[PDB]
Amino acid sequence: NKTVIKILGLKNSKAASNPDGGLRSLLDFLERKSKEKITLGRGIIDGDYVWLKVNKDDAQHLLRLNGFTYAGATLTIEETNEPMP
Amino acid sequence: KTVIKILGLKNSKAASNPDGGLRSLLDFLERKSKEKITLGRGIIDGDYVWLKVNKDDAQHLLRLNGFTYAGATLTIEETNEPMPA
């Protein structure tokens, strides 16, 4: 089944000044870093978080990337049963 | 010494505990291993539980990978990641 992932720290990063807030570049970075071949299509920014809806296997791959540094900011990745905003 | 990462406590019923269910989890791990293991240093960081243990202890903990605790599937893994302060 599907799962919701929250990513924190993009706003604090250097990528934040981008037109889209650095959203796509973040998702692109996550795809490269996992090396499991994760595919991130749609993501959104609500509040300080970046929200992703993914399958169970994908969720584990993202959680592995927790604590990595992106654009000069530490990424915090969390699984949640919260409804997608 | 070895570092162990545990995932799935947040999804469990013990998550609502005062200490996040850390103590109940470690208590469960000690009993389930049947080695009469003593778990010294542990912490909750993000969705993960971190444990610092000797090598033989790690093997018994690793056997419990995939087991269900408090209604949540546990993913137990060894890592060379530094333990967070």
Author numbering:
A (entry chain B): 97 to 181
B (entry chain A): 98 to 182
Q: How is this structure described in the published paper?
A:
The Mex67–Mtr2 complex (NXF1–NXT1 in metazoans and small bristles in Drosophila melanogastor) is the principal mRNA-export factor in Sacccharomyces cerevisiae. Mex67/NXF1 is a modular protein constructed from four domains: an RNA-recognition motif (RRM) domain, a leucine-rich repeat (LRR) domain, a nuclear transport factor 2-like (NTF2L) domain and an ubiquitin-associated (UBA) domain. Mtr2 is a ∼15–20 kDa protein that also has an NTF2-like fold and forms a tight heterodimeric complex with the Mex67 NTF2L domain.
Like other NXF family members, ctMex67RRM did not contain a typical RRM consensus sequence that is based on two motifs: RNP1, (K/R)o-G-(F/Y)o-(G/A)i-Fo-Vi-Xo-(F/Y)i, and RNP2, (L/I)i-(Y/F)o-(V/I)i-(G/N)o-(G/N)o-(L/M)i, where the subscript ‘o’ or ‘i’ signifies whether the side chain is surface-exposed or facing the core of the RRM fold. In ctMex67RRM the RNP1 (residues 143–150) and RNP2 (residues 101–106) sequences were G-Do-Yo-Vi-Wo-Li-Ko-Vi and Ii-Ko-Ii-Lo-G-Li, respectively. The RNP2 motif appeared to be more conserved than RNP1, although the characteristic aromatic group at position 2 that typically forms ring-stacking interactions with RNA was instead lysine in ctMex67RRM. The large deviations from the RNP1 and RNP2 sequences found in different members of the NXF1/Mex67 family may reflect that they bind RNA in a more general, non-base-specific way, as appeared to be the case in the crystal structure of hsNXF1RRM-LRR–CTE-B, in which the hsNXF1 RRM domain formed mainly phosphate–backbone interactions with the CTE-B RNA. The UBA domain showed the greatest conservation (29% sequence identity over 55 residues), whereas the RRM domain had the lowest (15% identity over 73 residues). Classically, binding of the RNA cargo has been attributed to the RRM and LRR domains because together these domains are sufficient for Homo sapiens NXF1 to bind the viral RNA CTE (constitutive transport element) sequence motif.
